Amino acid sequence: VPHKSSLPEGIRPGTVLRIRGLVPPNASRFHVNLLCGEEQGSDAALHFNPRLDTSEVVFNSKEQGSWGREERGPGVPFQRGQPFEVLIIASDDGFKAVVGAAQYHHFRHRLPLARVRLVEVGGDVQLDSVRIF
Amino acid sequence: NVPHKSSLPEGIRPGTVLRIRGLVPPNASRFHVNLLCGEEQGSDAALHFNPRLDTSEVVFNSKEQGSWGREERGPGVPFQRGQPFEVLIIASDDGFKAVVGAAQYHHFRHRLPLARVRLVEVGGDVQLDSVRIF
């Protein structure tokens, strides 16, 4: 099942998104999106997109239809058939991505944190839990 | 067991997430997490976070000039003798947010300025697996 949930007020510096799940043994890719509205293709403050098929993790944002400059984490801290824990942490400057007891990548903001209205987590992924503190 | 005392790598700013995983010993009385503003003993503390199994409570408070402030108390004791626990302390620009296990537990509004906190301490009757500052 894909996870979609609303953040009607916004994310402030201090919001923490915790995701726990499994990467299916035949996964291609999955994604974590933080969006500015209820429509698919709405602006994306963060697109967190680990591709097991091509062995990269990709970070970017979307404004008015078009992707920004892509950012790529180092190595791939996911593996097929194996469970994971991701923390996405919001600062005043960017997003911290923590995967498996270690920081992984920092993503300078491109969109005001305040314009975020939605968390969606879909793709080739089994979710045990998705929660925002 | 062993205690954790750690200097901070970027102080404590809005977005800092301390995660503590461990277990409460079967003969535990009380343990604590401190966000201290100084290295010496009795120093001011922005956050004192003290699960007490002996008096069935969790206290939250700040210390300034040796003088404890207004104590706050969590809902219940989400801590068990002989059992693992996972605690997150998240610094927002409003307060600190204690998350125990899977749910938010309490929110302590800042009292001391976030600028003063330069040390993390975790000790007492707590067996520690991992202490990470993110």
Ligand SMILES: OC[C@H]1O[C@@H](O[C@H]2[C@H](O)[C@@H](O)[C@@H](O)O[C@@H]2CO)[C@H](O)[C@@H](O)[C@H]1O
């Ligand atoms: O930036 C994230 C989106 O990028 C798209 O893929 C990019 C690809 O990563 C890049 O290296 C280059 O080859 O062009 C592609 C566009 O054709 C994905 O297609 C998209 O879903 C997002 O992941």
Ligand SMILES: OC[C@H]1O[C@@H](O[C@H]2[C@H](O)[C@@H](O)[C@@H](O)O[C@@H]2CO)[C@H](O)[C@@H](O)[C@H]1O
């Ligand atoms: O404020 C936290 C500190 O409380 C001290 O104990 C308090 C106690 O919590 C309160 O119920 C009342 O009885 O006054 C006591 C002071 O004797 C602790 O001694 C200190 O370690 C903190 O946990």
